[PDB]
Amino acid sequence: GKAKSRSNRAGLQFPVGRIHRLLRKGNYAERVGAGAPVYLAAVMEYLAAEVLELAGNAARDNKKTRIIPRHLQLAIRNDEELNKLLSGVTIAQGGVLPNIQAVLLPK
Amino acid sequence: KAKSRSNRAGLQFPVGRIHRLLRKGNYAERVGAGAPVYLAAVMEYLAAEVLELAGNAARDNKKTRIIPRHLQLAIRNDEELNKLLSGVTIAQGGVLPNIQAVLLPK
Amino acid sequence: RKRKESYAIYIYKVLKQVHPDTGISSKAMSIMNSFVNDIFERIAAEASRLAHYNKRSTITSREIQTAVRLLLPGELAKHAVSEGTKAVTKYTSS
Amino acid sequence: KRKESYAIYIYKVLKQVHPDTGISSKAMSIMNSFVNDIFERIAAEASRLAHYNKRSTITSREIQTAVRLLLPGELAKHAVSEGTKAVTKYTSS
Amino acid sequence: VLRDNIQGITKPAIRRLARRGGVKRISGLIYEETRGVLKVFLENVIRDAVTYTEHAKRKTVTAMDVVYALKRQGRTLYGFG
Amino acid sequence: KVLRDNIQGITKPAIRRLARRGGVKRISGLIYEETRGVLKVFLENVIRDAVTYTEHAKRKTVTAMDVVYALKRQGRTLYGFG
Amino acid sequence: KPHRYRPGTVALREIRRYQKSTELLIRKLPFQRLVREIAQDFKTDLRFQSSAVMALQEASEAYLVGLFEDTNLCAIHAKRVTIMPKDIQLARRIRGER
Amino acid sequence: KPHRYRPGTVALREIRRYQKSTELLIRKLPFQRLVREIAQDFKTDLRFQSSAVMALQEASEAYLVGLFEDTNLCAIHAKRVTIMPKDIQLARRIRGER
Amino acid sequence: RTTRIKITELNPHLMCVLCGGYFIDATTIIECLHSFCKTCIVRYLETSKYCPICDVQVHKTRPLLNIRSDKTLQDIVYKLVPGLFKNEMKRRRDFYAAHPSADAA
Amino acid sequence: RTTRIKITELNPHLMCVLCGGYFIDATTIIECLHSFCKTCIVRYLETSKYCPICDVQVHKTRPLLNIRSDKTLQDIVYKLVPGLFKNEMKRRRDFYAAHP
Amino acid sequence: KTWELSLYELQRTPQEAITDGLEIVVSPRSLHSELMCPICLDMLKNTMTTKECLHRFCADCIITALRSGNKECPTCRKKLVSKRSLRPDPNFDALISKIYP
Amino acid sequence: TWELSLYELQRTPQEAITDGLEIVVSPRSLHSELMCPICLDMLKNTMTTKECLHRFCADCIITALRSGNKECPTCRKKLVSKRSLRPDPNFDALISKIYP
DNA sequence: ACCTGGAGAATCCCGGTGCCGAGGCCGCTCAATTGGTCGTAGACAGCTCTAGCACCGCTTAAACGCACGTACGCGCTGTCCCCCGCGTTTTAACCGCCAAGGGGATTACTCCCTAGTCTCCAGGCACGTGTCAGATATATACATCCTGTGTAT
DNA sequence: ATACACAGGATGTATATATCTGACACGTGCCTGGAGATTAGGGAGTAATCCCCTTGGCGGTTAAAACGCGGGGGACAGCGCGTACGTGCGTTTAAGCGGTGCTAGAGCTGTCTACGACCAATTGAGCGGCCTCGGCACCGGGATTCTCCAGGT
Ligand SMILES: [Zn+2]
Ligand SMILES: [Zn+2]
Ligand SMILES: [Zn+2]
Ligand SMILES: [Zn+2]
Ligand SMILES: [Zn+2]
Ligand SMILES: [Zn+2]
Ligand SMILES: [Zn+2]
Ligand SMILES: [Zn+2]
Asked: Where do the record's region annotations for Interaction with nucleosomes via an acidic patch on histone H2A and histone H2B lie (chain L)?
């Protein structure tokens, strides 16, 4: 009689049931199948882990314990595929990469 | 004894068909009574404007029909309509004549 | 043989109302039909977004009006709003 | 006043990947927004896919097709594999 | 009372933004053009923000209004809600 | 069969005509390969998305509406084919 | 001795001629063969509708004409009259395609 | 004689400094007044959340930085090192904003 | 060519509804192309933000930005009404003859 | 250092599961990094399109583009196995001798 | 603010309408300049007025001018996008119908 | 290309040494193809490039990509991210068994 | 045409200190889970016939290769004024309060509007037919480009 | 002597009549979807209350903005060379039109049953406060890197 969660039945950390309800109430179609939210949650967790791992490496490089927006920006603008995914997105308090054109250097 | 809602609103575009398309299109749980009439009026207005300009362009050419070239000329020579359709490509429309001043002979 | 629907006859009626002695070819009418579908879809989507932001479950003429204000530029928006309000006032009077 | 966000799950994932590392409130706000944006994009593409083929149900197949259309390159392959693995584990349970 | 507040976008601020952009030498007729560009951009965004606020029957502009206004322009913002 | 070398079917005079419709007067000689590269990139992207749409529908034939959906996905709306 | 036009006269003639018309400027069969060859790298034994190939050709020619339109402006920017590969590269960088 | 740096040195120093920092580069109150002044043409006696002014400022700064990067590319194309209004106009036209 | 008309038929198209007199320094609202007097409309727009006749909103927040002078109508009414410009000039001179301040306006 | 390693322990790591023998001109599949012989993979892929171990697709239509020759692995197997490279060259030259 | 009322305007009195039946004499040349379309050089018909300069034209005249030519006012060269920048002026039409039917 | 030659179509299989035999090896024998080009040490958690088949340590390549050019250290070929590589378990197992 | 030494100014590194924001705990209540029934969306087998692929001559207009010369791309030089680096003097943004209150956010009640159901008939769509708007062909007539040649300053 | 307007030759572009056919526009019979009346319940408009947060005033300290000057290096115009483009001609290739035959696959129907919506009862996961130390911000100092101009050859 114990309640067993669907995220645990799937091996995920993201919430399957909440995503199911959001899909049902969002005006996307009349019906929603059983495996659709599991697939969506798996994809979402994978992308989150990718970005967090890159930003953790960037934070370690800087000798810091806490991730701030700068590390997210560096992790995302130094990767071609992620840059292509977020080309029209601005991140608050990020900044830019260092880049000086060759023709402008002295000598 | 049955009167169409289009006549009641003084319109041509269909109000019942647009109501049904709003109901089955996954936009919201409920559709009101004034929404289809309003949207039908707006669609009629925009269509009439475009067709008027294209008809003028056709008249200039000594042609009694409108072809995609005339629609292209009408749209691109109009500033607001050109903003509305800035990302659209019309087949068999060509381009607007234009040559830069530095290329012409002196 | 299955029935397929379009806005062709309504476009022809509008054209006869504006230019009484003019025709139109198949490709031009195809383009006009695409234009009408695009406009309908854009306005419907923006109205749906408005309704959802505000925690409401209905699309009324108010959503359509604000969506038109958001979408069309310049004087086209003014003229469209005037025509829509005229039509609604005429319709509700019956 | 009950509000909902993805904060605790994102924290669990970070702890899985980086056992000793912290996050700031604004960075967590950015991560929340990023997750929401991805959810919305994929759900909208799935809705369109179901409408083009005249179906009333969004399934795992639609999610996979949307992920293929939306993600570039290797991200698509890895995300597809992870989703399929999750569904297979779920069904056999 | 609010008038001629576009001159508060001083020249040195414009130079700092250009330096973050990577520019090395600046002409004296760049500042007025920059101000024109900025004013047009702000008019366009604030119009949509005020439309959203007015529809929701409020008198206060929130951050969600700005976020949606930017999203309309194709300039998604992250980190405000 | 394995088709090959078809990119050279886009000949020099055709690219010259295209540049004429764009308002170009003099054309350098190294510019006929760049155009072929750009055309190949564009075509690959559009055709891949069209093939994805076709495959989801469980069909063996690409249709005009597949091309239209693919183009619209890339922000290139096209009027005149349905 | 023939009546030789000076350089650039026929060029302006052809610009005017091709900005007055709406016909396709690339031969059909070469374009169709290129399209089939590219499609062969994603799925085996594909079939096409004729209108699909027509739509692809229309979109491609529109794209190339617009790109040359921007390229000519980039070339005039640098006090020139002749386009070069660097102009195309700059136009595609600023447009975001690179 | 007193020490004086050659032209172009302090400029490179400033590029290095501002390409590594992350703070806002326009003063706060002047931007606030500009926002209120522009909005006074749409509704009277409006109130603003502080986070709304902050979001507006962040977006505006991002816009201007991107524009200046494109302008520098356009200026270097024509074999100069000084950016000019025509470079801004060319970049905006090719972007589709003009 | 040759024609003489009565003042009764011409009167309706020359009088401002707000004041009732003939147009003086006519100014037109562009939202509906409606002509009134300068002083009449200037005083009216303060309290209200709608047209006196059709109640059409002049502007969303500031109506004064959407009104402009009408020189042609003023010239037409000056040429039509007999002894109107002279009376206006006489009244202006009479009013400003006893005020020794702000000579240049 | 010095060691006395028994080949019987290293057999499974250096055995092709398609021809029942050691690797010759090793070729690896990019997607799964599963090594085989040039002949084995070339003749096997003409019918199927999945790796014969992990059952993973190699390419949508042309798998041959996703296989690469692993020189390092072939060198390792030649060096570790005594009296194999010489025998291979001897057999190749003997075959060449018997035909024009 | 370019709209402050002058001292006289702050106390100007309305002009009484003429009620006595006195005939009015009008010559065609007196109204010739102000009632003439600059483009077609004829009497105005279906008057259209601009939203920026208040310059009267015939509908067809302005439509043709904007179609094939610069998008500017023929008189003062002020820019106008299209015909939506103009509106009808029925008052001038009624005045024309009355004075010169 | 990958077209087989006349002799390749009929290569005989190489029989495996079923009988238990001992082979003496030295660390210097394999001190060239088991060595990381970056840290100059034994491989752990090996990662291999898809395009060129070059082995590295996971941390070595991850740091090299993060903190430098996005090319391969040896062949200088295009490389986007750690997704462009793949782990090699067989190589690690062989190294572990060969060298305790 | 290249080199070195040395002074000066700026960036990086290192402790040391203090606060405040991030990680953690605790009680509770609202949303996820289990269990049951019911109706239809979707899978699958089978059938029709449309349209997509393949083949063959035959004209002929476009593509391909060649040659001459001209005008445009590119480097060099000289000139000068516009912009950078730095010092002095003014302006006003930023920060610490206090006091007030407009309106954002929530609660409760009531009734009006929208969904779902059923009958029934007119608006819209698939075929079929036939003239004329527009393309195609010939022939003058007109409007541009180029060059020889006098000849005026 | 050299610029320079002029005039005659020869292309190419525009124009009027003839005519030929195939696509726009209309008519028609039928069937599917819009219209009319009825019923029931919950979404939204309305009125009242509380208290968070936005707006306004003010006094102070101090980094940032403004003004000015002096000199160097960067934009800009001009001249000369040369070589890669354009224009025109004489061959050669392959697009294009018409016609043919073949059959793979898209578009339907008709069963039929598994899967998702709906409702009700039960309780554990997730959220709003609250307390609190450890990461990080700030200040001063010593070291370390790098421009810049005087010889030096
Ligand atoms: Zn008055
Ligand atoms: Zn009015
Ligand atoms: Zn083998
Ligand atoms: Zn494998
Ligand atoms: Zn006229
Ligand atoms: Zn004017
Ligand atoms: Zn290593
Ligand atoms: Zn490599």
From this structure: 78-83
Domains and CATH numbers, chain L: 37-100 (3.30.40.10)
Cα–Cα nearest to K60, from B60, L36, I78, A9: B60
The CATH architecture of the domain made up of A3-106 is Orthogonal Bundle (1.10)
User: Could you write out the DSSP letters of every residue in H45-90?
Assistant: S-EE-HHHHHHHHHHHHHHHHHHHHHHHHHHHHTT-SSB-HHHHHH
Helix F64-73, helix G50-77: angle, nearest 10: 30
- Homologous superfamily, domain I13-96: Zinc/RING finger domain, C3HC4 (zinc finger) (3.30.40.10)
DSSP K53: S
Q: Which CATH number covers residue C13? A: 1.10.20.10
Distances (CA, A) of D79 to D36, D41, D65, F49: 17, 15, 12, 18
- CATH homologous superfamily for the domain E1-81: Histone, subunit A (1.10.20.10)
Contacts with H65 (C-beta within 8 Å, 6 or more apart), sequence order: A96, E17, E20, E21
SS (H, E, C) F3-70: CCCHHHHCCHHHHHHHHHHCCCCEECCCHHHHHHHHHHHHHHHHHHHHHHHHHHCCCCEECHHHHHHH
- Domain residue spans of chain B: 2-105
Domain boundaries, chain E: 1-81
CA geometry: angle at C10 spanning C7 and C14, to 5°? Answer: 135
Given 1.20.1440.20, 1.10.760.10, 1.10.20.10, 1.10.10.10, which CATH number is that of F1-82? 1.10.20.10
How far apart CA J67 and CA J65 sit, in angstroms, is 6
Contact G68, F24 (CB under 8 A): yes
Q: Which of residues 44-103 of B touch strand N (CB under 7 A)?
A: 65
**Cα–chain-centroid distance for residue I71?**
10
SS3 A12: coil
What contacts K63, CB < 8 A, 6 or more positions away? B56, K83
Contact F13, G67 (CB under 8 A): no
Declared resolution, Å:
2.9
Nucleotides of N under 7 A from a protein CB: 9-13, 23-26, 32-36, 43-44, 53-55, 64-66, 72-76, 84-89, 94-96, 104-108, 115-117, 123-128, 135-136, 147-149
In this complex, the answer to whether residue F56 has its CB under 7 A from any atom of chain N, a nucleic strand, is: no
The residues placing their C-beta within 5 Å of ligand 6, an ion, are K 53, 55, 73, 75-76, 78
In whole angstroms, what is the distance from residue B36 CA to residue C13 CA? Answer: 20
Measured CA to C1', the nucleotide nearest H13 is: M10
Domain residue limits at H56: 24-98
CATH topology assigned to domain B2-105 = Histone, subunit A (1.10.20)
CA dihedral (A64, A67, A70, A74) positive or negative:
positive
Write the CA distances from F69 to A2, C40, D69, F79, K98, integer angstroms. 48, 17, 11, 12, 60
Fold held by J7-98: Herpes Virus-1 (3.30.40)
Distance between CA atoms of residues F2 and J60, nearest Å = 15
